[PDB]
Amino acid sequence: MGPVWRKHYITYRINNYTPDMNREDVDYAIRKAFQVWSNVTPLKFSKINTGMADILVVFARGAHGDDHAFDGKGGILAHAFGPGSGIGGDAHFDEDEFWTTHSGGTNLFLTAVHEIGHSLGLGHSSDPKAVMFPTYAYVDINTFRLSADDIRGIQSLYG
Ligand SMILES: NC(=O)[C@H](CCC(=O)O)NC(=O)[C@H](CCC(=O)O)NC(=O)[C@@H](CC(=O)O)Cc1cc(-c2ccc(-c3cccc(Cl)c3)cc2)no1
Ligand SMILES: [Ca+2]
Ligand SMILES: [Ca+2]
Ligand SMILES: [Ca+2]
Ligand SMILES: [Zn+2]
Numbered sequence: 001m002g003p004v005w006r007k008h009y010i011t012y013r014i015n016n017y018t019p020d021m022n023r024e025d026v027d028y029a030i031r032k033a034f035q036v037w038s039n040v041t042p043l044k045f046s047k048i049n050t051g052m053a054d055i056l057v058v059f060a061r062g063a064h065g066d067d068h069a070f071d072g073k074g075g076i077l078a079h080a081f082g083p084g085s086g087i088g089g090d091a092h093f094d095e096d097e098f099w100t101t102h103s104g105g106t107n108l109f110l111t112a113v114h115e116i117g118h119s120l121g122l123g124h125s126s127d128p129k130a131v132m133f134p135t136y137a138y139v140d141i142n143t144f145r146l147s148a149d150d151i152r153g154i155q156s157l158y159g
């Protein structure tokens with residue numbers, strides 16, 4: 001019962017890139033994270049490089065211009081705004097983390113799946129196997145799956 005996008009075509013734009021990973025791997029992690037949610041909804045996501053994207057993806061540090069300051073390495077990993085204009089939908093990742101493609105540091109793909117869930121209107125889950133559980137855990141991204149609770153939540157908002 002959060003806000004929802006009132007359309008099924010949603011654009012995203014990567015505002016800037018963490019130096020922790022190469023550009024190609026950031027693009028891949030974000031694209032695959034959107035695909036997790038498009039696989040179970042009517043939503044489609046396209047990446048744009050200019051113009052007026054719905055979901056801006058940002059890496060930033062500490063106090064970074066909104067009311068949700070980051071805390072250095074550890075603790076908060078990222079945060080995201082629910083659907084809406086302007087800053088609505090945007091997903092912010094704490095650059096004081098070490099973002100990775102793998103099990104070390106903080107896995108960008110898994111964090112992005114969680115944050116995009118918020119960007120689409122989801123809240124938190126009580127299921128410890130749900131990607132929308134409040135605290136991060138690494139799972140083999142090659143075999144990652146949304147939990148049945150995640151699919152229930154997002155199918156209740158769209159379709
Ligand atoms: N507290 C913790 O365990 C870690 C600490 C990291 C550290 O200090 O080293 N930090 C977090 O989990 C933070 C802060 C939590 C808090 O203090 O309340 N959590 C976040 O940053 C989330 C913020 C938000 O709600 O948007 C972001 C988040 C959650 C996840 C996540 C990823 C995978 C899973 C998961 C779990 C089980 C199975 C599967 Cl498939 C997936 C669950 C959650 N990724 O990013
Ligand atoms: Ca942090
Ligand atoms: Ca936005
Ligand atoms: Ca970093
Ligand atoms: Zn922010």
Ligand SMILES: [Zn+2]
Nearest residue numbers: 114118124134
């Ligand atoms: Zn969350």
